DNA sequence: GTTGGATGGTAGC
DNA sequence: TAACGCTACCATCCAACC
């Protein structure tokens, strides 16, 4: 098998330089304002330039203006980055049809039909790259190797603007020498509950009795790491199935009033039911960002598919459920639609 | 004896 | 100092179904 594996450089800042280039070489931040007070809201992203200073993914704008008052400021358009991201994942599925698309900004190519060996298919990953540059003027990371989780970590460390072969014995060589804490998949949590058995590469894997490793980390992730260690991990690339659909915003002010909180959830349901495009769900879970930035939801699944009409009516229910189970004040709330038929 | 829904945790696999 | 937005998969606990 080879996998090819795409993950657009800085890819909100990188479409707003796109659309005004005069931004180019000086400091993005592409932001969210959630309105409750001025410069209220997160950054969604920043490119490079900014990340020097410490402005990334999910700090607060407030926080980001200290460190970089002169930095450019400019709205989420998500619709404006979608529409880059379905343009290239087109243009990605001209190279191979299996595709599977795993975020707005990656995508996991089959090519092991298109090229017989790394060094064609590090040829077609160049390839891409200036195609995507000719087209788009975006510029992305390429990660080349056997498997998907392998492509991810060529990718990881070439990025930015980056291509990348993890070739047999390269695999071979990171499954004894790559820190297991830079394994997909494995984050804080993990990595810690792995260090207190003394496993701290791929390989320490096959030393330990299964049951152990289980015991701490759970069955599913003790498959995954000793089939990884084995050099056996063979997920095959398949069509995105999305599995569920949602949409969270933020309130004005914290609040535990069903009719000021009204307003927002069907906002969140409006374009929630929208963004399903003929997916009809069986499932619908109200989650609501309580004050102390803890989520919490409530649920129904129902034996048929949920209309809109039934959304409203059961979200409201499901949101006084939550009220009713929980003190505290509510933040941010919105709606998350599944099991789709 | 399973099956799977409800809720939440982990990691962006 | 304040913390937006989006989603797959898994674990635990529990009721329903044999
Ligand atoms: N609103 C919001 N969007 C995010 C967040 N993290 C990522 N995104 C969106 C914005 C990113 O441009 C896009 C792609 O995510 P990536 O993790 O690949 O980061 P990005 O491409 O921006 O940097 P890159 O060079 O990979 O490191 O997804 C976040 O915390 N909030
Ligand atoms: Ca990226
Ligand atoms: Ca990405
Ligand atoms: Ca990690």
Known sequence: GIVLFVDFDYFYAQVEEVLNPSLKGKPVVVCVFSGRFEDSGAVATANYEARKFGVKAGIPIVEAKKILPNAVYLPMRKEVYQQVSSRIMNLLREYSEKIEIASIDEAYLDISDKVRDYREAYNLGLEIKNKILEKEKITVTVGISKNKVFAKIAADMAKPNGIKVIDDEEVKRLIRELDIADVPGIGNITAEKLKKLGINKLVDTLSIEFDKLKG????????????????????????????????????????????????????????????????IPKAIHVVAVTEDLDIVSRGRTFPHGISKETAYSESVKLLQKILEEDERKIRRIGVRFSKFI
Not at 234 to 242: A, D, K, S
């Open 216 to 279: 701490m980390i759970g069955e599913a992730k003790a498959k995954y790491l000793i089939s990884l260690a084995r050099d056996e991990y063979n997920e095959p690339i398949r069509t995105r199935v999305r599995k569920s659909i949602g949409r969270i915003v933020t309130m004005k002010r914290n609040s535990r009033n069903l009719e000021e909180i009204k307003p927002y959830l069907f906002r969140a349901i409006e374009e929630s039911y929208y963004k399903l495009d003929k997916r």
